[PDB]
Amino acid sequence: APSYRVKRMDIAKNDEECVVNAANPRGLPGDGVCKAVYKKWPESFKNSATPVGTAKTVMCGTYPVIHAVGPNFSNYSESEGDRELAAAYREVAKEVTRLGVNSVAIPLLSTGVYSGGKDRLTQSLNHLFTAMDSTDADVVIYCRDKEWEKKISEAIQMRT
Amino acid sequence: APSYRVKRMDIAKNDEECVVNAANPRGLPGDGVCKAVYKKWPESFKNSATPVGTAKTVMCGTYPVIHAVGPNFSNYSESEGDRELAAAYREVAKEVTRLGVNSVAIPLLSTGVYSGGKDRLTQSLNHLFTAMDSTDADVVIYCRDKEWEKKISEAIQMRT
Amino acid sequence: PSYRVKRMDIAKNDEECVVNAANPRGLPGDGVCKAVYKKWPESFKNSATPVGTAKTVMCGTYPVIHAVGPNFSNYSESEGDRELAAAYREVAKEVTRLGVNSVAIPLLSTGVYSGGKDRLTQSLNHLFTAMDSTDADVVIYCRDKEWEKKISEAIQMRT
Amino acid sequence: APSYRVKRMDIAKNDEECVVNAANPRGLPGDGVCKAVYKKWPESFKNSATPVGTAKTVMCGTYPVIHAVGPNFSNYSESEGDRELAAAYREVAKEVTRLGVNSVAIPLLSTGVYSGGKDRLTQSLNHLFTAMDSTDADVVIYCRDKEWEKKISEAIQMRT
Ligand SMILES: CC(C)Cc1cc(C(=O)O)[nH]c(=O)n1
Ligand SMILES: CC(C)Cc1cc(C(=O)O)[nH]c(=O)n1
Ligand SMILES: CC(C)Cc1cc(C(=O)O)[nH]c(=O)n1
Ligand SMILES: CC(C)Cc1cc(C(=O)O)[nH]c(=O)n1
């Protein structure tokens, strides 16, 4: 019985079986979720580079870390960006399957420094749901804001 | 004359002035010891969320429940987890002291589903002693395994 | 009451009794408590006493006053200040009851019980306040050069 | 089956059951590996002084820090320094065995500011192998230079 969940804290401080990193295409430390991921899991960044709209697993010991590269909407148009964001989440779902875990911590890709100024909560979350709906894992979504916790909560409740 | 004792029984039926819950950061029911604590004192889980390495007290009536959150060693390194386990027990001693109680019931934190498949009896117990040695409360340690009871009892005996 | 300070091991004091910076469970512990345990081990027989209290146990005829200051890691600043005053108050009572002319005393709650905070002034002010009620010579023991200078100044500006 | 591995990262974020500090015989914080170690485990430097060619374990909570003092080759002759470097690793092996740990994080001793201006990758690594081959522990070697990572990896693989 796979479920969707949402919790307001640092995604590094998680009690799920794996984590998705909001990564850049060069696999460098960056900022945001990527900083906290580089702090708690620096070993995961070895050969973590992968193109925009793709994902890549690097295990640090026993806990898998999936580097998902959403588009930077400063470089991408809204049209082309939307395709790449869908593509990134598609590979996250695959990696949650193709590896084969039971739970996953996942941030909303392209909703911070890659957002290009715009609020992309609903956009990113809908691409998250679309891709992850074909997986067996318990999904848990992370963020630093309470408004965002409530709006993600209502999103989850009104589809169940 | 403050003492340490060990009892092999359900901590939900303790004979002490407060109880430590082996809690998760989400203040959810959980499983095992955390489930039995939720069954006996359900209303103590209102706003009981507190991060790893901390303890938060919530009253069930006037009976204090100290929600102590040890690290999950599946998701923490040996180094970082050891530091957070020490911090969790330190905050338990803080809360026992704040409440003014003469006795406290306590489980061994990070020793079950949070142990990362490692025997952490000695690790958890030494952090417990280290924290609680500066308090004047009677401490009763609760376990379920008969062998663990023996090894905990021996550890208590060779301090005096 | 007189007041002095010396930078040396309190286990080698030259006073008629000693105050142990004790823990509530009567355990040998570390720091000043360990040194006290090495020189006067038999004074730790039933030496456990609650926070903010003192209990005298004789080693031969030499009284060891086990005073338990609060660990400021466990106590709030409010409750810890009250318990620190209570510990020193219990010491002064025992010094009066024993009838000693002198006493060796450390600064309670200033080391591993400090909660990462400088409590020289706090502990010393509770010391003065409690130990002014006796007429015994008080000798304070530390191991830091800085502490010795600060403790000296606080004695002189109250003469 | 115990392995040797190499990771190019800060040893202070290791995922092993204990760490070897590249130390000085004074027991002082220093620079390089020693600084990072001092920042993560400062209480392990309490009475950590140990002579050149020896190692000394100081606990930080329950996490062992093994202070190992390789020779400064600026001060030593090539033959005497070689003897002291080998001895230091021998003492590391003893501590690892005595602690009963399943794994250890270790730097290459005498290869930076103690190198005397020479490349001692092969010299130091072979003394490490000689000592640690008699232990049951997984060994993870930590370095910072990309090249050194490759050469250490090659050296590991051509033994198996
Ligand atoms: C290191 C980071 C700048 C890379 C990043 C940031 C976001 C974001 O803005 O949430 N999303 C993403 O897919 N990648
Ligand atoms: C709901 C529980 C899974 C949370 C928990 C379990 C232990 C334990 O394994 O004993 N410790 C702890 O601090 N917290
Ligand atoms: C065995 C010790 C940890 C007990 C102790 C330490 C201090 C202190 O930190 O000076 N004060 C005190 O009253 N008791
Ligand atoms: C504080 C540090 C200067 C001490 C040090 C440095 C090296 C080294 O050069 O890698 N090796 C060693 O055994 N000890």
Residue numbers in the entry:
A (entry chain B), B (entry chain C), D (entry chain A): 1 to 160
C (entry chain D): 2 to 160
From the article:
The nsP3 has a highly conserved macrodomain across species at the N-terminus, a central zinc-binding domain, and a C-terminal hypervariable domain (HVD). Recent work has demonstrated that CHIKV nsP3 macrodomain (nsP3MD) possesses mono(ADP-ribose) (MAR) hydrolase activity, which specifically removes the MAR moiety from aspartate and glutamate residues but not from lysine residues in substrate proteins. Mutants affecting MAR hydrolase activity and ADP-ribose binding slow viral replication in mammalian cells and reduce CHIKV virulence in mice. These results suggest that the nsP3 macrodomain is critical for CHIKV replication and may be a pharmaceutical target for anti-CHIKV drug discovery.
